[PDB]
Design a protein around this nucleic acid. Structure first.
Lengths: 62, 88, 74, 73, 77, 67, 65
RNA sequence: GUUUU
């Protein structure tokens, strides 16, 4: 699980091959990334956003 | 179910995971679940995403293509008869 | 009805087309509820059996269910 | 008026099935199941936008999976 | 039943077609109903089209696990 | 908090959805469920101003919300 | 969650998965969210079908017309 | 009935 990752900064690599720096406040068993202060990896995109598990290829702890 | 077992049989090991995206990643298998989602301590480059600062990663299971494993880490008669037993 | 058809053509010769457009001609050995298909002595053609033969399989061929577009007789 | 009742009434008629891709089948509808898999009789199969890929003879189990549209007629 | 007929060839060399013009030949060590697979002594060959020409590439690995969602066909060489 | 519960307790607020088509949808949200199917109202879509609009969860890339 | 009954004999632009738009007259429907449309136009790009059935497992969006 | 076969 990502139950170790709560509130840490994270790097997400999407299946389309883009990277994002973010903070994961919450997540579900479909790896739907509930995150805030998202931005590329280089201009921010949002504070508080929802990413769908289907587009996550990979989550890394930073 | 079966491959959940087998993947658990491989913890504390260093494997090479290749994703569909063609990204490729070496590491120590720290955790396995049912969807086959993967966890790795000690991320390294062997095709590699541009990360230098990340230690431990969560690989979405649905996006793996290959897991590369040494012949040693595995009993082949075990897997074979297990498979022979699996129901479908 | 679909349920019984897949019992009705066992042993016959079928064309199975996959999502890719590849098609496989051969005798039906068996099939399951997940769309999986076992052919014996299957040949591989693209789009049509009138096209270039691309492969002959001497032994059994396992076609994965998710990938199956159709199972056609003739 | 329920979708399946429509598809039921088109049993024994000519039906046009349009895939979520660029492919179409026309033929007699014989039967369908709950997953809307489809039996077709003497289907002509087409690639669109045309081209006639094949004339089928006998019955065809057309995987309901990729089915997007059905059209009686 | 096609998965049983698959069971027939355990410890027997197999030829698998995958999405993306990828072919694997190797010895069938394991598999489940998702067509997930473990193979040994397996070479993968990939067909790639770049610069308007075809080429083929290769990749040997002793033990390899294979995600079943990409699997297309299984037979024997 | 799970993103989905955090969607059910979002009924009435205003949100933006990105479909995996390149298409963008601003709109306030009138209903949600377990597959993330959405019924929005007061809606505009890009690459058009609409009363209602239903969306299949599996066609969502992401969902930008408010500060 | 959507009550399609309020669309009886109405117009709706239905987006399908694979880039296929369809404008029809919502003649009927069910719970998997299958439609029955009338005077169906399939925007591929104009293409006219008649009274069609739309499999509601590839239905991507549903608005009005 | 819909993301990890």
């Amino acid at each position: 699980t990502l139950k170790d990752y709560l509130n840490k900064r994270v790097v997400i690599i999407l299946v389309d091959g883009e990277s994002l720096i973010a903070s994961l406040n919450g997540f579900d068993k479909n790896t739907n990334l509930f995150l805030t202060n998202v931005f590329n990896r280089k201009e921010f995109i949002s504070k508080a956003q929802l990413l769908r598990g289907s587009e996550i290829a990979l989550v890394g702890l930073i | 179910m079966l491959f959940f077992s087998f993947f658990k049989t491989l913890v504390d090991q260093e494997v090479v995971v290749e994703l569909k995206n063609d990204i490729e990643i070496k590491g120590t298998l720290q955790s396995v679940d049912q969807f086959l989602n993967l966890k790795l301590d000690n991320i390294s480059s062997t095709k590699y995403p541009h990360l230098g600062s990340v230690r431990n990663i969560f690989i979405r299971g649905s996006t793996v293509r290959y897991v590369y494993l040494n012949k040693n880490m595995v009993d082949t008669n075990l897997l074979q008869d297990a498979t022979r037993r699996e129901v479908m | 009805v679909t349920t019984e058809f897949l019992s009705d053509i066992i042993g016959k010769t079928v064309n199975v087309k996959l999502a890719s457009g590849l098609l496989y001609s051969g005798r039906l050995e068996s099939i399951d509820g997940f769309m999986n298909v076992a052919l014996s002595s299957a040949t591989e053609h693209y789009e049509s059996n009138n096209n270039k033969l691309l492969n002959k399989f001497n032994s059994d061929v396992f076609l994965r269910g998710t990938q199956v577009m159709y199972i056609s007789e003739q | 008026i329920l979708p399946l009742e429509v598809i039921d009434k088109t049993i024994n008629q000519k039906v046009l099935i349009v895939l979520q891709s660029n492919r179409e089948f026309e033929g007699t509808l014989v039967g369908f199941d709950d997953f809307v898999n489809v039996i077709l009789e003497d289907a002509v199969e087409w690639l669109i936008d045309n081209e006639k890929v094949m004339q089928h003879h006998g019955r065809m189990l057309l995987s309901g999976n990729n089915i997007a549209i059905l059209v009686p007629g | 039943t096609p998965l049983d007929l698959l069971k027939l060839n355990l410890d027997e060399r197999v030829y698998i077609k995958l999405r993306g013009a990828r072919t694997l030949v190797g010895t069938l060590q394991a598999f489940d109903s998702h067509s997930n697979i473990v193979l040994s002594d397996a070479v993968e060959t990939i067909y790639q089209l770049n610069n308007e020409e075809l080429s083929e590439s290769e990749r040997r690995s002793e033990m390899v696990f294979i995600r079943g969602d990409t699997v297309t066909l299984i037979s024997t060489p | 908090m799970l993103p989905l519960y955090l969607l059910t307790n979002a009924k009435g607020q205003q949100m933006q959805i990105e479909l995996k088509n390149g298409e963008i949808i601003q709109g306030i949200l009138t209903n949600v469920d377990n597959w993330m199917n959405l019924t929005l109202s007061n809606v505009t879509e890009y690459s058009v101003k609409l009363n209602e609009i239903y969306i299949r969860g599996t066609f969502i890339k992401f969902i930008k919300l408010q500060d | 969650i959507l009550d399609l009954a309020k669309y009886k004999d109405s117009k709706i632009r239905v987006k399908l998965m694979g880039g296929k738009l369809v404008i029809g007259v919502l003649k009927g429907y069910d719970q998997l969210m299958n439609l029955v449309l009338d005077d169906t136009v399939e925007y591929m790009n104009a293409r006219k079908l008649g009274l069609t059935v739309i499999r509601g497992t590839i239905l991507v969006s549903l608005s009005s017309a």
